[PDB]
Assembly symmetry: C2
Amino acid sequence: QRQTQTINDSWKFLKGECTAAADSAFDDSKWTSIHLPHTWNTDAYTEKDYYRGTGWYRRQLTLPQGWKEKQIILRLDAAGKSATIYINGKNVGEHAGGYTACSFNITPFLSFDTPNTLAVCVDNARQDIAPISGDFTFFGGIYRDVWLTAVPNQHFNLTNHGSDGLFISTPQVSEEQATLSIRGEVKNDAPEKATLELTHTIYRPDGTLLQTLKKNIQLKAGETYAFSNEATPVLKPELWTPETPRLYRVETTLRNRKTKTLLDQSNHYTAFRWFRFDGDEGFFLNGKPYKLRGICRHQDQKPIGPALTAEMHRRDFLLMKEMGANFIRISHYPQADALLEMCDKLGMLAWEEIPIIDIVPNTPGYGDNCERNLREMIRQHYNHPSIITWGYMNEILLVTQRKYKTEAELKPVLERTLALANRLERVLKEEDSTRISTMAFHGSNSYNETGLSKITDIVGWNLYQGWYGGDLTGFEKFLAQQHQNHPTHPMIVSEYGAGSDKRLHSLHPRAFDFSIEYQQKYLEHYLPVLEDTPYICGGTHWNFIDFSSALINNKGLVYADRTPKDVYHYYQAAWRKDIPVLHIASRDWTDRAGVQQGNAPVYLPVKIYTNLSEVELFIDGISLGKQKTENYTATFEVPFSNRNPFLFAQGNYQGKTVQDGLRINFTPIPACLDANNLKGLELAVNVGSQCFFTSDESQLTWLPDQPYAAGSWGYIGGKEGTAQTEIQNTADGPLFQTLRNEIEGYRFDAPQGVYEIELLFTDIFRRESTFGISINGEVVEESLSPCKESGYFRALRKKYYITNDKEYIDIRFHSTSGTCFLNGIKLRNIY
Amino acid sequence: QRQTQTINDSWKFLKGECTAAADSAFDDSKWTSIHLPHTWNTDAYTEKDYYRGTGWYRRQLTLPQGWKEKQIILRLDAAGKSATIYINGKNVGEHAGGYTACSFNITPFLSFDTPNTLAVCVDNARQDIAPISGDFTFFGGIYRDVWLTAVPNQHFNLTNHGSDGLFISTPQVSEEQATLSIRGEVKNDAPEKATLELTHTIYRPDGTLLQTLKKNIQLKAGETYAFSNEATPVLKPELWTPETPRLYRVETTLRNRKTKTLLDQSNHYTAFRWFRFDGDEGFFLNGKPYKLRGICRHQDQKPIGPALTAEMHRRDFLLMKEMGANFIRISHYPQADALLEMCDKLGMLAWEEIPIIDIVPNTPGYGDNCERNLREMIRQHYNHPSIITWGYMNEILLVTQRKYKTEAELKPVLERTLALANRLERVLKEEDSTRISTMAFHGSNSYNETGLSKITDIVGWNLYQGWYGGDLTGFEKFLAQQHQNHPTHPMIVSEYGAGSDKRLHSLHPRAFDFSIEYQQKYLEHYLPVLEDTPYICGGTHWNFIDFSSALRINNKGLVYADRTPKDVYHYYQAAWRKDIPVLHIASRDWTDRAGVQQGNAPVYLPVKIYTNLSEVELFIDGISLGKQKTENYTATFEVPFSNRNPFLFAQGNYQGKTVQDGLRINFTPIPACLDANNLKGLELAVNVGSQCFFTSDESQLTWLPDQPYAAGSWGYIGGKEGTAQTEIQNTADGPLFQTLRNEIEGYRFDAPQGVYEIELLFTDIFRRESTFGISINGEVVEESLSPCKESGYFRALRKKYYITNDKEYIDIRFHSTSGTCFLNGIKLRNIY
Ligand code: NA
Ligand code: NA
């Protein structure tokens, strides 16, 4: 019978090409001891010292005696970008693509006397294998399990594109009666004939047997046999939705028939479900209408050790289901098997796609390798009922439109692109005609004007109105105009979202400030549009989780360490009717600070996400009133005063009482500096920005810029300036990324003493900008030119010890070349 | 007038030896662009590729025109471990000491018409500059600010051991009156003669002027003038304590006697306080009993970028001060100045020490460089009122007694050591008779036999009874013993604590499981002994914050490295604050709960409460669990966990007001008796051989503590518990693999028929090599598995098998061949 285990242990690994490291006689003593899954560049210095090259994986296989008359199948669940397999120095085969599995019958190349050498030649630098752009162009390693399967010589075909060789489909489904079709290949690898018996046992969702199918066959030696057995129509079927995921086990045993011995066995689930996308009326599931409540999802495990990302795939999914999503868009996800299994068993419709993104260049064999990835994805995941559609292209004109302008420049690229698109579109339905095809566009109409939208069953629009330029209400406007022009093209919003930093907070949120509060606004707008519009089949939000790459990736709902952002609970409130949701949406904001008048309490908004009709918010036991909820949200102006306040909210749902609680930190900052309130104070201002930044260098909260008023402090002159480049030499990137430009001076009305002043600059204007600085009429810097000394986009921090013998600190800026700017200022009383 | 700024920007750097890197013409185009501070080696392996040697720092100096007449003093607040500085290829000077400052008058080497090149050679592999052992042996870089100061040609001495040049101290302090002595050195770097006015103004804590002192002085060219000005005795002085930190500012101004023009100006705080240490009655502060509630502290900041570690020193202090601490014990702290400024102003007593530790080597120059460092430390901090005692050694016998075991190879090292101890004790009292001296020992009576404890004014014991062996009561017993044999040695417990890991929790915590709960058991035993024992002056806990080192147990702190307090932080806060209400549900350390559940009966797990309220009431999801009266500032509730997202809520009455705390956590129930339905989406994982829950950082699974097999359930068969303390290769989930069931016979789950994924976890930890097979219901999956031969000792193996169960149970059997069978963890989950 059949036996499957992992060989993930006791590997040696050498980063670099090497002189037949496939040889069994090799000295791998000084290579690195590694344990698979193994991910290559888990240390990011950008392009410089990010490894693009060939690596070598080596492990000894000492075989078990119980396998000497058994075929041995070696499978690699995923290995990117491409690997070649050496048993004992000999080439068994290669693979191209780091998101599908591959498998090789390695029985010939193996002896049972001396230990065998398994060597793998992996390469992440291959521009002829998708993806060719984006964060995963160089995703390298054997970053998934590796399996040794042993079977009798009469087995199912485990070398059909890395799949199970089995394919269960349902050719007709209705509420009353559905048909089943079980297909696959059997392979005789013994040197003679064989008379066998093929059984199909079909179980109900409750465990009991429903139907048995026996059929029996003969096979000349070496023969591979193609079976295809219909089944008795299932009467009154148990139908499958993400809310009701009823699965029928299909056990497929293979018996010797002279002796009724069991040989090989292979279980698979299937389920009964039908669906259609209507261009006017939306999605339908089992006859009944249904909103796709989706999120996108690709490889995004956090690096937790040397060459080792996390393995949280499963508990990640629990977090999607408890948010109440019913749809997942999958791409760049190695061993997506693991994810779809839970999409089947726990409930979540799915699309998956091979990753052909951004541009179709003239790279030889790109097209050929892409069609193979498309076939592999479909065959390896055929038997998942959660999968209702296969894609293959994502924003395929995005880089083309940046790189080619004249229609004489685009004609050879568009020809090439429509060509690969149609090619893969036929491969798709040649491989599986029981699912819908889709293609995701970026927000331009040239996916219509070039023909790419007439190819696929349905179409995805990646819309970022209100993020990458534009206004929030152009989201509905873009979709409306798309449904007016092309009403037969049923639409999904396959990507939307806005990035956010836990470090950033605003009371006046605008796009590209990266504040928690703006992503909350942007998603508070989009989510009703997706639900209350009928001709929108639903959406898939930008990748569920935040992630980083050396080569903007913070638009998710869950932080990289798997804590949900506050806004997670906004979806949960809107998508889970079954349980009460009550979230004080201030986990993202436990380090609060504001400017205070004398002893007048400070008011900062505290938001609440709930699905309760009304909710009460208390602080230190003092009811702040009741508030009716609209769009699952409610905002209180909370009077922060005391330093360790305690927020508490409650309300009612379905008879019972629902509560939440949370402790935060609040620090007040004086509006008018006298000498009591200056002591132990570090007054830090995020010049030229409207955001509270909370520092990782210092854990100080750098306050928003405010204009100088008599008795107080603030800026004099200038206008807000923003840049979006990586600022080097600091962890506090965002503080340097916003300045006040054409600044005249900065002033604090502060008593006499000795003060430490820090000033923060970064030149972001690639005549050069040079200026002088003075304090209380005495020159501390005669000519400061941030770009000649640091360079553009590096960071400067200058600290000055100042002896103030006036009643104010008047810092002022002296234009010489270009413009005066200030990126941050910090004041500190010393004496 | 005095102008002082940083030259931290615009540096190029090169990791390794280079020649002509000092010269101004040199090409540093292809060098690394950096901003100071700059810490070396923010990357973790040990002796391999953690850098040891020379490194070069380059910057261009554009001297302003209005500075042409002035003197230029260059101050490096700290460089580790050694720095040599070049101005335009010319060697200005040298420093030896990773923790003190250095200063140089660079006026003669600078050009005012061209640009200058500032060039610094840093060497961290210096086996003659303390510390020569421990986590800071190779701490390297210019990891503190670098400054340019420009003064007129008559100024205060900026080049006396890299200090301010001024020295203020109170010769007599009492309730009735005190005296104030202001000393310093005025420097004339002109070629002429100068006639000057020197003024000291003394301000009251409230800011008003108490007094002015003028004195005319005359200096030849190139002269250093040592002044020493008494002040009018201060009547009814405002006394300083950590709870009342009144400071008198002293402004020292240098004027030209003719034109009354301001030349230099140096502000300092002084303060009036006195103290003693008694062998019987402990510590006294302004004549009252005072118990030292202390914490240790050294360089602490987490890496936050390439070569860049945080500068959270001032926020790290508010944490110490809000816990209620009144004492801090400082060492391996570069530019401690910033810390002691908080001590002075916000209120906390300090002791400081240069880092001589572990062994005194036979190293030419070491003793000399230590003396030079002790002086630097005292002169740079002489004016900090909060400093009450200086120290220089710390377990100076620890490594000596390990490496050497015969009294012949011991005799030279013990001579070398008392020799250096006396030298430094002489130097200390020479530099500062205003402050008591101290030494920190490890827990061995050898410091009394050798006579090391007859040297300093007080002694400190670094005691870990209950952690490194013994049991918690050996603590008070050790001190009880010490006080009785040397009663004239006043005692501070100068270090204590116990390591902990947020990932681990136990209901029966024993030393070295690293469970959060043992650390609380340990600190709940120690703190009362510290308060209630008279002859103990106080304690200083282990380093306030967890920290990782890249060399060769670094988690005994009260605060995690992300600067979040552990839960036991509030045990200290409740015992040490009386001003504010403290009421903390001790469960931030434990928000991923899980446990074994009978049917649907609720799973009882403990929830501890730290507070200084007299009685607390705990609710879960709104259901009161009833009030509890609090003792030793703690209350435990046995809580019934049901729902998967409970809401804990406590309340009580402090000072007639109401006090509340609340917290949402997570609970996963795991079924004791499996069936075809509770396996649906289950992942049953067992920390085999441990009695501890382990929440994983790979998966987020909470691996349940081992239970033995009982019919209808699951569990182990056979074998003893076994534990290890080496770290483990190839996994983030270390503690999982550090405990196993040794000589295990098997593991059995009673589960239905079906297809199951079984994952087994091994690490051989026993230097024939063990080998065994593994059968699951009679099928042989591993035929000859040997973790040590295949992988290695202390490497992880994760084997994973797909198996088809036709019995009503999964009976895993271990079949020995050589050595013993063992299992560090097992995880099952149903596929079909
Ligand atoms: Na800014
Ligand atoms: Na274990």
